[PDB]
Every structure is written in structure tokens, then in C-alpha cells.
Design a protein around this ligand. Structure first.
Ligand code: ZN
Lengths: 245, 201, 549, 190, 101
């Protein structure tokens, strides 16, 4: 993102990213700017509500005075606080899901990070606190496994990053997992300016994808829910062409 | 004659389709779960029937053997309604559904049964001493003739309410100059159920 | 009076102005446990204050010691306190050492006490601004003379005025404890004045008013027409709610047990026909034979009992019950129907509630018993909602069991003739027997005493004497003694009902305790129930015999 | 979050939350039009509707705000068009006449229904029980059609044009696992 | 909440190996550090059930004294029922001091 149409757009983007991450079998990149705006918004809203609450408290407790009218007073602050609680819950769920995913795929992401030929970097995928979490957790687990078990095996197989012999130890994500998608179409209101979409009988603009394993082509129209594998659908999901349910 | 049977069947269908407490139609979901596991039977609690309407309970208590088949065919009508799509018009291997009742009335000892309990619903307890080997009973019989040599089908229920209850063979043929009962039974293409005898002490 | 009936709303408004807050609990309610009317009023208030989103807390208490301890526990943040079901008869300021100048600023706190007992503390009315109550229409008319003396008592020949004031105060005091109105009735009057009445409120008011039928039939008869008029003012689809005035009878769980068991366990018929010996059973079988109901038919459940005689039961009773003097059993009651679950009546509902209160789930075991009683109160409160019926069927079966046990004990008492007739009052002590551990509950003891009082009143004796009943709990080695007032037969005219029989037992007990060093513990909210020692009972009793009642 | 396998699918509570995060129409009982007062000034909802409001007029608010006002006496939720007998009749006729197509129906199906029947009970013009029975009948018909359609499970893809959220959620794990098993069997065979 | 709840779950945790116990302590340290960064204003170890209602009825389960809250105080009398805000008692409910949500 570069600019905001409205904070509601940021809320919608956050929810869409959360839904995409929850069902994705692969660790997706990190939307820094969205949460950069959101945290500041939360801070300023909390400051405002606390300020007005403290002001009313001082007014009510300096003397008897007049108690605040229940009309247009309790309901607004109730709405702000419940909305803030809901937003915090959503952010918490998103962060915890990301933590679980980086827990599962620690060795694989560490392996890809040290590869110079790979264009993807760990910095884009992970926030700084997530980097610290990954490295410290990996070191602690390595210390535990070395003290407990690896101290006794011979030198030939002491490394837990072995990719030789019978069975490998690195868990790549399942890119062929079947997922439920909704073809959102182009995010633009014109929804007819993409260079990819074509047409069939009775109009019905659609996108044509192919499966190399089955040597087949599948037509994906706008407004139809499909159950389709994940390996070839990464680009459409990234371009916000389709939304995972 | 037939209108009263249709009215009673409609009343039972309305009861089964309408009975809900809070936010659940219990009997319809019971039918769904029963059909999904190939158990074509339904259990009716008597208190629910009493609470819904008293006239149906009165009629059931008056003449049980006549009334029950109407209910047990209303059940299969509702099952075919809520399980099979008409598709603007097949297997249809759904027999007549079995009705099972439960109640919490006062028990009656075996020695207290007398001439006043004839053709009435009773509840009692005892001990099982022997079980007979199972036997077959016809439900849908294919009947073939000899002289005129045509086909007919006979539908028979298991409730009798009387000693005879049996239409053995129609007198005269269905309309030349055949015998009194010139019919036979085609054992193939026939439907049979199972029956068992028990001794209580 | 402090708060008249017309002023209630104003006080209510004050509560809001002192309790409506965003994140602060500023209202605490103390309820009189082991009382149906208090439970009904608490439920109605809870619904009312849930409507306007006013945060609150409910705390049940059992004894005055608990009341004082919990009041000490409270913080100054709680602006408003409710005390429902008790507290009228004593001065709270002396009990709670309330300094008016500590709570002046005026109205640092507010304590709304709402009680039904007609005799109460006059100083609590005319002395203190901090303590405030809702009058039922008694101070304005009855107390017109005492207030003059109190105001005047708040040159050598002026001692006549002091003597007259002292005499007036003494005359106002020395009066037995009675109840003349219902808390639920007062709350429903407030709701009618405000404009929030509905069917749930009407049902709770009906329960609260019918919980007094056993002991305060005069109050019940005074209050019935208002309920009738209000219920008049306010296809069987699965969501219909029907409140109808159907005929009913003084019978024990008629619509949930067999008719035979109902006639057998009904207290009024027991008293009128002497069912404790064999002649009563013979007369009951005569009743059934002359009515024409078969015995095996009448011993069946009400659901499966024959429809024809169910329809003709009213005519059968009207034609058969005249000969044997049971024609007073017929009355008019309220019937509630919701959905296809069935029909219930107010009498059956209150019996189930009382039984569920009784049965559910030294100093240390006394505290454990009081905690179990509090837990039973909470369970009975939770059983109120219509979403639970396994918590009401259990109550009904427990009511049947408890009535069976009470009948079994009462027949033994009557046949052994343990009722000793003294010159002033009758006495009975349960030294030994079965299932004595059940009678540690004051309400169970009161039920047993009520049955004994009915049995004694339905006799040819022309002496109205109070009855004293005692029990034993071997683990504690104490006697739980309750004092009971006499009752007139239910089939009597209103001319000989000038005033209900007063209870002087609390006064006698407190006087004897204040003049002798008995090891008693008078802490129950009901002032006529005390705990006494086994070794100390007999001399105490002698004192009660020799003291002016 | 992890909680065992709760990281793969949505819980019904999350479904209810995401559905209730939607706009709805309201007929207010009070007025807080600005004196020509405290600003609502929320961060995830247009406050112009909440601030510029007047009684007995139509306006759009989020569903949870409407429910909160309905808990008080400040609200009167307007029922949607598809919650009436005359629309449900043509709907059920549409499913019965078409034994292959799932009928057009909003994806908030059954959920807005549950919520409205739970809270907004007295504002319906039609009796509640009849609407509930019609909804149950629609549920049964769609269940039968789903069972009929599930009988074939290709390894390449599948299409479900008009399934609601809950219907998709309650079926996701079984379909997903079976299709994954078939796909890996085919992949290992080649 | 990364405290291992030694006040309440197995009591001694002695069925774990010493290496496993030190690993648990290290992970609790990581959990404490994680919410000490840029997410200090969000309780990450809080409830994960979406908020659905604002006011709930709460019944006391264990006896205590009085506990201060923001703008108010709650006295935990044994067997009492509260009508309070949902988001003010979630910490107590998670600890097990309150019941009947
Ligand atoms: Zn022929």
C-alpha cells in the first residue's frame, strides 16, 4: 500500500490478509504498512477514550455537579471500546497463526534464507520480532536435542539438517493442497481491463489456468466457488484476483 | 370410508412435520439419521403425542390395530417426501417403516390380565425363558392365474385385529369361465420380512 | 411513612442517579434466604436492572452475623444497598454502628430496606435519614398516635407527659410478629406505575402471592382480586403462552401424581378424615366407591387417566363431596401453558421450589450446613428459567419424597401421643426416630409443624394454644426449637378474623436469654427459631412455663 | 492459532463474527442530529450515518451496532426481502423444479436467519414458526442435493456455485482430505 | 500467559525431564519477551474466542477478598452472581476463579 482511501479499506485489507493466511499452506509475505497504520490508530483511539473518561471522572469526582446524561454518552464509548476489542482479537489471531506457521517451517525457511541464488529474503517474509523468535527458538531446540540425544551418535550423522540417505528432514510446504477459492475478479470497478481474462459463450469473462501434471485447462469464471489445487493458483491469489475461503 | 383414513394420515403427517420444541424439529432429524444408516424405523414418545393433540391419542387408544398401519404408512410417505427428489416426475426400495412406541404408564401384572384388556395397549414386565427360531412372512405377493393366466399383486399388512384378517384368494377371476380360485403364488419377485416368537414368565 | 406507594418511582430514579455507571458496580443486594417471596422479588429486580444495563451483584445471607460481617466487608464505593426480606424489626444503626456524621457531606450512601413484617422498629422510621424503607400503607394510618409520643420524647408537673409517652411506647411494643403484605406485590405495583409489566412479571408476582397461601390465607384473600383483574387485563402454535383461571383444589401435585395419592397426601383431607388410622382409609375407599372411579383406574398417572372421567371430574366432585364436609377444597387457581410441554399450576410450582430449596446437590459443620443452604438457594434460583425442566422434575419428585417422609413421621407422632398438653401451650420433642437428619432444615421443620397444627386444629378441642416443637442433631448435640402459632380452620367466616394470631415466642426467648446465661444462638432471620443445648433445654422450658407469655 | 487442528478451518463463532461484520438497515427510535451531543467518531465505520440520523427514517449501520441498539429500545431492525413466505415459496419451487442447480441465495444464509430469529423476534410481520419451517425445508433440500452431487470426486477440480459459508465449512475437511489422498495416489503412480 | 501456573494441570511438573524443564523455562522467557516489543498494547495470550456480547452474567466459584478494577472494585464473596462487562473478567475466568459464563 502507498496511501489510504479510508481506514475501512485498511480494515478490509487486514481481514482479507487474515483469511488468506489462515488457510494458506505456505507462509506468505508480511504487510508492514497496514499494521504500521493500524497500531498508531489503536494508540490514538485508546488515548482519546482514556482522556475523555478521565475528564468525565474528574468532573464527577471534583464535586457533586451534574452526572453525565446516559443519552449519547455511554453508547458511544461502549461502541469504541467494543470495536477496539474486536480489532485486537483479529490482530491477535493473525499474529498467533503466523507464529504457528513459522514454528512449523523453521528449518525450511532457514535453509532458503542462506541461499544466495534465491531472490526471496527472510526480511520481507518475517517481522523483526519474528526473526528473533525464529533464531532463538532454533538455537534453544538445537541445544536441547544436542544435549539429550545428539551427544551419543557418531560423527557420520550428528547433523539434523541431513538431506542424504533414506529420508530427508526438511519439511517443504504442500503446494498441491486443495483449497476453496472464490473468483473475486479484478479489484477495479471496470473489471474488464486485465490482460489475462477471456470470454466464452454468453459472455462470462473467465481466466484460463493449466495443470502440467494432468495436461488440462480449467476455465474459472467470475462469481463461482471452485475447489482447486494451490501450486498454480499462487499468482492469482497474490494479484488479489481470487480470495480464499 | 377412505376419507377418514386420509384425514388420519394427514393429521399424523402434520404432527410429525410440525412437532418442534425450542428450535429443533426432532422427528425429522431422527428420520434423516435413521435413513442415512439404513434403519427404516421411527420411535414415538407417547407424552409428545398426548401434548400435541388429545384426539389422536384417544383414537390410538380406542382401536390400535386399525389405526397403527395408517401411521406407519404416513411415516414412509414423509420419508419419501424428505429424502427423494421428484426431478419433475427408479429404485424406491423403501418398505413400510416400522413404528416403535415408548410410554410411562402404570405396569400391569401378568396374572391381572383378564377379558377387559382385549385389543388394548398394555405395559408389563417379565423374564425371558425361551426364544424361537426366526421365520418368514410375506408382505407383497405375486399371484398368477392358470386358465385366464394374468398377473396380480397382493399387499398384506401384519396387523390383524381379528383371527382371520386373511384374504386367501379372490372368488372368481378378474374381468372366460375359470374356476373358483385358479391362482398360484410366484415365489420369486416377492417380498418377505422376519418374525420371531418368545415366551415370558 | 418514609416512602409511600406513590413515591416509589422517585426513589427508583434516585437509584439510577446513584448507580448508572460505565465500569463500576455501585449496587449490592442482600436477600432473605429460605424465602420464596424474597426470591421472586429478587428475580423481578434482576430482570428490571438487566433491562437498563445497570451492573449489580446478588449476595444471599442466612444469619445476622453474616449480615454484619458482609456489611463490614463492603467498601465506600457501593452507593446503593438493598436489603430485601428482613431487617424491618430491628434498628440497623445500632446493629451496624452507623455514624450519620461519618456519612454526611448528606446521602453518602443509601440503604433501601424492604420487608413485610407488620410490627417493626419505630425508631428506624422516625429517627434516621440514612435508613429508608418502602411502606405498604401502615404508618400513614395505624401509627398516627405513636409518632406524636416519639416526636415529643425525642415544671414539676411535666412528668405526666413523660409517663404518658413511656406508656404509649410500651403499648405500641409488646406485640407479636405478623406479616400483612407481599414484597412481590409491592414490586409489581411499582412496575405497574412505571410501565414495564409483562407475562414474566405477572408469573413471578403470582408465585410470590401464592407462596403465602399456607400461613397467611387472609393476606392471600385480600390480594387475590388484584391479581385476577390484572390477569384479565393482560391455534396451539408451539410458542403460545396461556395464563388462565382454571378451577383447582387443595391437592398435593394433582397433575403430576395419581388422584389416589393426591387425596391421600392432601393435608386438608388428612385432617378432615383422620387418615393416620385405618378408619380414614376405609372412609377414603368409601369416597372412591361412591364417586364411581375404579381403584385401579384412580391409581394411574394423570396423563394416562381416562379422558371421560377427566372431563367429568368437576361434576363428580360437586355431586359427591357435600356429604362428608370436603366442599371447601374447591377453589380457583392460575394455570400456565407454554408450547407442547404441558400445563402447570402455581401451587405445584411453589411446592417444587420449596422442595428444591430443602433438598439439593461444631461451628465448622454449622458453617458447612449454611453454605449448603446457600448453594441450594442458588440452584433453586437457576431453576426459575423456562429453558430448564430437568431442574423442575427433580424438584417435583423431591417434593413427593419429602411429603412422604413428613407423613410417615407425623403418623408415628400422633399414634405415640407425644404431644404433651400443658396449661398454657402444647409441647412435643423428637427424641429419637428414623431420618431425623432431614429436620435440621427450618423450612422442613415448619412444614412438619404446619401439618401438626392442621391436624390439631381439625379436632373437637376448644383450646387455642401455641405449639413448641424440638429436634435433635447428634453430631452437634443441640436442640433446634421452633415456636408455632395456632391457626383457625380454613372453612371459617371472616367475622371471627379481626386480627391474625400474634407470635410472642421471639419476645419470650429474648427475655429469657437476657435474664439467664443459657448457651443459645439466636441468629436466624425468623426470630421464633432458636438453637438450644440438650442439657439446657429443660430448665429453659421451665422458665418459659413460669414466665409471662 | 494452533489449538490442535483449529489452525486449518474456521470455527462457527468466527463465521458468526465475520457474518455479523456486515451492514444492515435500521429504523431508529431516538434522534441525535447535531444541534444546528458526543461524536461517535469510530475508526472502522462511516460515522456520518450514526451522527446524521433522525427518527423514523431508513439508514444503514453495521449489524453488531444494530444488535446493541436492539438490546436497548433504540432500534427496530428491518427484515430483509428474502425473509418472507412469498419469496421462500418461489425459492423452494425453484429448487424443486431444477434438480441440478443450487439456487441463488446470499452466502450469509442460515446465519442471519439464526441471529434474527434469536434477537429480532417481535418485528416480523409473518409468524416465526412458519418461516423457520420453510428454512428447515430449504436446508433439507439443499442437503439432499449436496449428497447427490458429492457422489463423484474428480482429482482435478470441482465446482460449487451457490453454497453458503456454513455448508462449505462443514464439508471442507472431508473433501479436502479425500481429494489430497487421490491426488497423491495419482502423483505416486506416475 | 507464560507463567506455567505453578499455583494451580500437573502440580510438581516433575514428570518432565530437567532438560525439558529448562526448555520450558526458556520458552516462557521467549513468550514474555515477544509481547514486550511493538505489540505491548495487545494481550497476545488472551482469549481467542471472538467477542460476541458486551454484558454477561458471572457466578463466583472460589472465595477471595476484594479485587480492584478500573474505575471500580469487585468483592469476591463466595457464591455470588455478577452482572458485569464481558471484557473485564476474562483474566479471572481464564484463571478459574469465575464460572457460569
Ligand atoms: Zn381371467
Amino acid at each position: 500500500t502507498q496511501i489510504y482511501v479510508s481506514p475501512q479499506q485498511d480494515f478490509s485489507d487486514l481481514m482479507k490478509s487474515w483469511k488468506n493466511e489462515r488457510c494458506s499452506p505456505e507462509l506468505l509475505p508480511y504487510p508492514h504498512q497496514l499494521m504500521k497504520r493500524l497500531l498508531n490508530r489503536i494508540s490514538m483511539q485508546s488515548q482519546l477514550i482514556e482522556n475523555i473518561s478521565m475528564g468525565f471522572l474528574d468532573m464527577q469526582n471534583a464535586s457533586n455537579a451534574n452526572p453525565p446524561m446516559p443519552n449519547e454518552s455511554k453508547l458511544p464509548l461502549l461502541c469504541m471500546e467494543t470495536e477496539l476489542e474486536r480489532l485486537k482479537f483479529v490482530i491477535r489471531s493473525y499474529i498467533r497463526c503466523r507464529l504457528s506457521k513459522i514454528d512449523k517451517f523453521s528449518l525450511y525457511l532457514r535453509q532458503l534464507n542462506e541461499d544466495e541464488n534465491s531472490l526471496i529474503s527472510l526480511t520481507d517474509l518475517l517481522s523483526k520480532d519474528e526473526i528473533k523468535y525464529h533464531d532463538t527458538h532454533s538455537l534453544i531446540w538445537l541445544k536441547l536435542v544436542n544435549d539429550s540425544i545428539l551427544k551419543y551418535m557418531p560423527e557420520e550423522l550428528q547433523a539434523i539438517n541431513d538431506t542424504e540417505g533414506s529420508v530427508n528432514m526438511i519439511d517443504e510446504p504442500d503446494w498441491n493442497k486443495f483449497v476453496f477459492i472464490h473468483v473475486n475478479g479484478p479489484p477495479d470497478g471496470k473489471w474488464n481491463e486485465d490482460p489475462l481474462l477471456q470470454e466464452n459463450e454468453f459472455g462470462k469473462p473467465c481466466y484460463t489456468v493449466t495443470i502440467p501434471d494432468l495436461k488440462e485447462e480449467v476455465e474459472l469464471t467470475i462469481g463461482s466457488i471452485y475447489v482447486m489445487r494451490y501450486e498454480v493458483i499462487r499468482d492469482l491469489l497474490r494479484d488479489d484476483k481470487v480470495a480464499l475461503i | 370410508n377412505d376419507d377418514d383414513n386420509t384425514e388420519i394420515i394427514k393429521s399424523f403427517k402434520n404432527f410429525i412435520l410440525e412437532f418442534r420444541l425450542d428450535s429443533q424439529f426432532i422427528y425429522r432429524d431422527q428420520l434423516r439419521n435413521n435413513i442415512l444408516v439404513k434403519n427404516y424405523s421411527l420411535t414415538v414418545n407417547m407424552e409428545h403425542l398426548i401434548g400435541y393433540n388429545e384426539d389422536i391419542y384417544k383414537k390410538l387408544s380406542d382401536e390400535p390395530s386399525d389405526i397403527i398401519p395408517l401411521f406407519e404408512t404416513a411415516i414412509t410417505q414423509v420419508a419419501k417426501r424428505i429424502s427423494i427428489l421428484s426431478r419433475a416426475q427408479l429404485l424406491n426400495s423403501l418398505p413400510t417403516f416400522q413404528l416403535i412406541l415408548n410410554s410411562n404408564a402404570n405396569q400391569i401384572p401378568l396374572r391381572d390380565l383378564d377379558s377387559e384388556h382385549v385389543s388394548k395397549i398394555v405395559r408389563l414386565s417379565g423374564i425371558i425363558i425361551s426364544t424361537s427360531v426366526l421365520s418368514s412372512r410375506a408382505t407383497y405377493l405375486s399371484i398368477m392365474c392358470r386358465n385366464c393366466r394374468h398377473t396380480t399383486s397382493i399387499t398384506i399388512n401384519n396387523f390383524n385385529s381379528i383371527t382371520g384378517n386373511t384374504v386367501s384368494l379372490p372368488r372368481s377371476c378378474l374381468s372366460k369361465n375359470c374356476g373358483p380360485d385358479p391362482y398360484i403364488i410366484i415365489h420369486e419377485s416377492s417380498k418377505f420380512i422376519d418374525q420371531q416368537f418368545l415366551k415370558l414368565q | 411513612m418514609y416512602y409511600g406507594i406513590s413515591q416509589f418511582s422517585e426513589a427508583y430514579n434516585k437509584i439510577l442517579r446513584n448507580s448508572s455507571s460505565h465500569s463500576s458496580c455501585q449496587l449490592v443486594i442482600f436477600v432473605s434466604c429460605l424465602n420464596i417471596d424474597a426470591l421472586c422479588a429478587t428475580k423481578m429486580l434482576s430482570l428490571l436492572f438487566k433491562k437498563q444495563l445497570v451492573q449489580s451483584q446478588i449476595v444471599p445471607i442466612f444469619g445476622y452475623s453474616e449480615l454484619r460481617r458482609h456489611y463490614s466487608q463492603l467498601d465506600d464505593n457501593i452507593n446503593s444497598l438493598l436489603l430485601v426480606g428482613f431487617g424491618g424489626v430491628i434498628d440497623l444503626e445500632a446493629f451496624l454502628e452507623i455514624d450519620p456524621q461519618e456519612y454526611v457531606i448528606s446521602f453518602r450512601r443509601d440503604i433501601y430496606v424492604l420487608d413485610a413484617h407488620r410490627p417493626w422498629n419505630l425508631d428506624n422510621i422516625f429517627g434516621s435519614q440514612i435508613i429508608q424503607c418502602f411502606d405498604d400503607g401502615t404508618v400513614d394510618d395505624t401509627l398516627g398516635e405513636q409518632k406524636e409520643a416519639y416526636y415529643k420524647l425525642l415544671r414539676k408537673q411535666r412528668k405526666k407527659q413523660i409517663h404518658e409517652y413511656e406508656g404509649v411506647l410500651e403499648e405500641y411494643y409488646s406485640q407479636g410478629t405478623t406479616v400483612v403484605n407481599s414484597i412481590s406485590a409491592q414490586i409489581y405495583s411499582l412496575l405497574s406505575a412505571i410501565g414495564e409489566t409483562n407475562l414474566s412479571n405477572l408469573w413471578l408476582n403470582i408465585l410470590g402471592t401464592t407462596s403465602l397461601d399456607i400461613a397467611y390465607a387472609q393476606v392471600y384473600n385480600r390480594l387475590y382480586p388484584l391479581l385476577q383483574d390484572e390477569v384479565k387485563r393482560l391455534v396451539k402454535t408451539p410458542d403460545t403462552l396461556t395464563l388462565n383461571i382454571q378451577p383447582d383444589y387443595y391437592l398435593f401435585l394433582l397433575r403430576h401424581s395419581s388422584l389416589y395419592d393426591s387425596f391421600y397426601y392432601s393435608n386438608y383431607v388428612n385432617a378432615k378424615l383422620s387418615l393416620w388410622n385405618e378408619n380414614g382409609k376405609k372412609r377414603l375407599h368409601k369416597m372412591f366407591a361412591r364417586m364411581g372411579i375404579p381403584l385401579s383406574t384412580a391409581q394411574e398417572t394423570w396423563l394416562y387417566m381416562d379422558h371421560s372421567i377427566k372431563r367429568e371430574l368437576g361434576i363428580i366432585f360437586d355431586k359427591n363431596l357435600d356429604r362428608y364436609g370436603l366442599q371447601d377444597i374447591i377453589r380457583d387457581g392460575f394455570v400456565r401453558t407454554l408450547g407442547y410441554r404441558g400445563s402447570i399450576s402455581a401451587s405445584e410450582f411453589v411446592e417444587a421450589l420449596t422442595a428444591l430449596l430443602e433438598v439439593g446437590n461444631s461451628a465448622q459443620k454449622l458453617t458447612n450446613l449454611r453454605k449448603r443452604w446457600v448453594s441450594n438457594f442458588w440452584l433453586s434460583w437457576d431453576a426459575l428459567d423456562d429453558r430448564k425442566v430437568e431442574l423442575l422434575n427433580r424438584g417435583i419428585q423431591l417434593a413427593q419424597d419429602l411429603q412422604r417422609a413428613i407423613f410417615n413421621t407425623g403418623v408415628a407422632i400422633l399414634e405415640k401421643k407425644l404431644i404433651k398438653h400443658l396449661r398454657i401451650y402444647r409441647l412435643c420433642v423428637l427424641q429419637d426416630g428414623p431420618d431425623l437428619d432431614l429436620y435440621r432444615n427450618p423450612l422442613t421443620l415448619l412444614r412438619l409443624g404446619n401439618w401438626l397444627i392442621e391436624c390439631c386444629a381439625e379436632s373437637e378441642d376448644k383450646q387455642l394454644l401455641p405449639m413448641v416443637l424440638a429436634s435433635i442433631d447428634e453430631n452437634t448435640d443441640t436442640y433446634l426449637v421452633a415456636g408455632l402459632t395456632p391457626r383457625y380452620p380454613r372453612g371459617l367466616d371472616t367475622i371471627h378474623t379481626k386480627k391474625p394470631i400474634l407470635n410472642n415466642f421471639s419476645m419470650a426467648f429474648q427475655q429469657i436469654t437476657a435474664e439467664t446465661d443459657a448457651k443459645v444462638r439466636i441468629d436466624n432471620f425468623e426470630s421464633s427459631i432458636i438453637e438450644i443445648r440438650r442439657e439446657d433445654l429443660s430448665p429453659f422450658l421451665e422458665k418459659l412455663t413460669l414466665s409471662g407469655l | 492459532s494452533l489449538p490442535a487442528h483449529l489452525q486449518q478451518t474456521f470455527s462457527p463463532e468466527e463465521i458468526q463474527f465475520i457474518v455479523e461484520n456486515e451492514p444492515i438497515k435500521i429504523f431508529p427510535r431516538i434522534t441525535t442530529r447535531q444541534k444546528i451531543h458526543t461524536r461517535w467518531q469510530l475508526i472502522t465505520t462511516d460515522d456520518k450515518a450514526l451522527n446524521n440520523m433522525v427518527a423514523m427514517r431508513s439508514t444503514e449501520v453495521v449489524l453488531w451496532i444494530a444488535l446493541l441498539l436492539k438490546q436497548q429500545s433504540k432500534c427496530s431492525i428491518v427484515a430483509p426481502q428474502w425473509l418472507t413466505t412469498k419469496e421462500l415459496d418461489r425459492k423452494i419451487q425453484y429448487e424443486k423444479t431444477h434438480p441440478d442447480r443450487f439456487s441463488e441465495l446470499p452466502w450469509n444464509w442460515l446465519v442471519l436467519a439464526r441471529i434474527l430469529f434469536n434477537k429480532a423476534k417481535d418485528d416480523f410481520h409473518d409468524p416465526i414458526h412458519e418461516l423457520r419451517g420453510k428454512i428447515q425445508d430449504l436446508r433439507e433440500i439443499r442437503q439432499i442435493k449436496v449428497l447427490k452431487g458429492l457422489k463423484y470426486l474428480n482429482e482435478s477440480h470441482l465446482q460449487l456455485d451457490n453454497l453458503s459459508l456454513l455448508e462449505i465449512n462443514e464439508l471442507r475437511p472431508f473433501i479436502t482430505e479425500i481429494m489430497d489422498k487421490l491426488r497423491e495416489i495419482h502423483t505416486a503412480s506416475l | 500467559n507464560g507463567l506455567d501456573l505453578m499455583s494451580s494441570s500437573q502440580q510438581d511438573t516433575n514428570n518432565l525431564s530437567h532438560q525439558e524443564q529448562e526448555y520450558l523455562k526458556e520458552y516462557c522467557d521467549l513468550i514474555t519477551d515477544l509481547k514486550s516489543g511493538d505489540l505491548v498494547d495487545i494481550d497476545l495470550s488472551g482469549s481467542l474466542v471472538p467477542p460476541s456480547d458486551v454484558f454477561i452474567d458471572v457466578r463466583v466459584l472460589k472465595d477471595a477478598g476484594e479485587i480492584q478494577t478500573e474505575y471500580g472494585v469487585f468483592n469476591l464473596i463466595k457464591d455470588s452472581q455478577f452482572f458485569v462487562r464481558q471484557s473485564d473478567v476474562e483474566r479471572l475466568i481464564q484463571q478459574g476463579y469465575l464460572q457460569k459464563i
